[PDB]
């Protein structure tokens, strides 16, 4: 088995996925849905270990099923050091509202039409390169917000990211049900009149309240623990353990999009 699909980066095990005698499911990397590798996988002392000694490792995916985990491999020194020259542990700087009210303003006029030429940058309206894949949900929601980011920035506003994190699903079918489940979600969120609303494509079809936003990730029985609020420069933010992830040149975000580029969104649940 051959792929073209990797991440660099830390596994953590999964605690509340579904129970298998066959399959062990892990977190990878700043992935917001779970992986999972075959329990007689010559690959899964190499995951545990890496696990134990607190280090990130290259995971390679099934490119036929992408949840899968087909093999892992330690990194080189190098990509070791670029890997690490993006992270800190650092609290977040905001607990509350309040704190985020101390360019971040938005007109009414301003936050549609920003909505909308981000709907228009999606993989699906407009295929190209650096397009936006809003169309695959199961994952790639950081590097959605962080492009969204650069084109803000580009027009002189910026944002904040706010993160949800929990036993987060959504219904994304409009007919039927296609639920997916992530442990986080994150988007852009930008003040107008007053109000800090999220920009979200990959969930609404425009601006919505926070509420808003958080209740979409509440479908059957799924639950929200907690949000964080931080500066959009953050590219990841963990709130257990502090990791903070930074992408300052794009790298990642780039090399995200791209990789989700031609991706559909595939049902967790049915």
């Known amino acids: 088995q051959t792929s073209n699909d990797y991440i660099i980066g830390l596994i953590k095990k999964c605690d509340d996925c579904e129970v298998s005698t066959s399959k062990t499911f892990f977190?990878?990397?700043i992935k917001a849905g779970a992986s999972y590798v075959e329990n007689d996988s010559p690959y899964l002392n190499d995951i545990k270990e890496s696990i134990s000694n607190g280090t990130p490792i290259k995971i390679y995916f099934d490119e036929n099923e992408?949840?899968?985990i087909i093999s892992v491999v330690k990194i080189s020194n190098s990509e070791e050091k670029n890997w690490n020259l993006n992270v800190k542990y650092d609290e977040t700087p905001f607990k509350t509202i309040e704190d985020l009210n101390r360019s971040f303003d938005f007109t009414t006029t301003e936050a549609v039409n920003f909505f909308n030429a981000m709907k228009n940058k999606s993989c699906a309206i407009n295929n190209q390169?650096?397009?936006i894949p809003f169309q695959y949900a199961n994952d790639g929601c950081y590097a959605?917000?962080?492009?969204?980011?650069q084109h803000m920035n580009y027009a002189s506003k910026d944002c904040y990211k706010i993160f949800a994190y929990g036993n987060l699903k959504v219904n994304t079918s409009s007919t039927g049900v296609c639920g997916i489940a992530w442990r986080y979600h994150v988007a852009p969120l930008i003040s107008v009149n007053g109000v800090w609303n999220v920009i979200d494509p990959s969930l609404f079809n425009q601006p919505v309240t926070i509420t808003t936003w958080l209740n979409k990730m509440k479908y059957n029985g799924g639950t929200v623990a907690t949000t964080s609020y931080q500066n959009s420069s953050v590219y990841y933010y963990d709130y257990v353990s502090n990791y903070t992830q930074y992408d300052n040149n794009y790298t990642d975000t780039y090399s995200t999009l791209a990789?989700?580029?031609?991706?559909?969104t595939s049902c967790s649940f049915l």
């Open 66 to 68: 992408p949840e899968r």
């Open 27 to 29: 977190y990878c990397g």
């Open 129 to 131: 390169n650096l397009c």
């Open 144 to 149: 959605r917000a962080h492009m969204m980011r």
């Open 259 to 264: 990789n989700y580029r031609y991706r559909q």
